Amino acid sequence: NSNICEVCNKWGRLFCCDTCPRSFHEHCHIPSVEANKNPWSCIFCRIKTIQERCPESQSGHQESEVLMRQMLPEEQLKCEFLLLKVYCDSKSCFFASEPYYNREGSQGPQKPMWLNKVKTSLNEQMYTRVEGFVQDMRLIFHNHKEFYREDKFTRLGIQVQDIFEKNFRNIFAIQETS
């Protein structure tokens, strides 16, 4: 196994996957690394199994159909994995915890949103469809773009949204387009 957390790239108290060489901090893995379970298989491995069990699941899909899916166990897992892929980028630090808004010339968003709030919402099974998770994730970056206006810091929202969107298209096998 690797000697650093796959998510935050630091050492520490690491749980090792039994079926691949990745390792994780307890609360860096999503869901949080399970108490017992020997062997234990990481989210990466669980996602790869879904694909291997249903190879056709990799055929292209329309985004509108994916969004309307109910949050059955496989879709719950796919959203958890997508969330984890965003935390894998170090720039997610800006979006992880609860924001506050006091900048001359700007007003805070009407509906603040942040990664740890989406993480709790997934853990608490608050989303009934994929659409609820995706809308909160896109709202994080939209709020950031609107608040920061012409400040160059706006770019951090574009960057992390691009990580989200690329991983959304990969994990949910969205049909490739020009």
Binding site for Zn ion (CB under 5 A): 5, 7-8, 17, 20, 25, 28, 42, 44-45, 54
Residue whose CB is less far from Zn ion, 7 or 134: 7
Residue whose CB is less far from Zn ion, 9 or 106: 9
Q: Which residue is nearest to Zn ion (CB)?
A: 5
Residue whose CB is less far from Zn ion, 20 or 139: 20
Distance CA 46, CA 43 (A): 5
Minimum distance, C-beta of residue 55 to Zn ion, in the bound complex (Å): 7
Backbone angles phi, psi at 11, to 5 degrees: -80, 175
CB-side neighbour CA atoms (13 Å) of 2: 16
Cα dihedral across residues 154, 157, 163, 168: positive or negative: negative
Minimum distance, C-beta of residue 76 to Zn ion, in the bound complex (Å): 18
How far, rounded to the nearest angstrom, does the alpha carbon of residue 31 sit from its chain's CA centroid? 11
What are the C-alpha distances in Å from 129 to residues 66, 81, 90, 135? 9, 16, 28, 10
Residue whose CB is less far from Zn ion, 1 or 106: 1
Beta strand residue intervals within the chain, DSSP E: 14-16, 23-25
Minimum distance, C-beta of residue 5 to Zn ion, in the bound complex (Å): 3
For the chain, the first-to-last Cα distance in angstroms comes to 39
Residue whose CB is less far from Zn ion, 2 or 121: 2
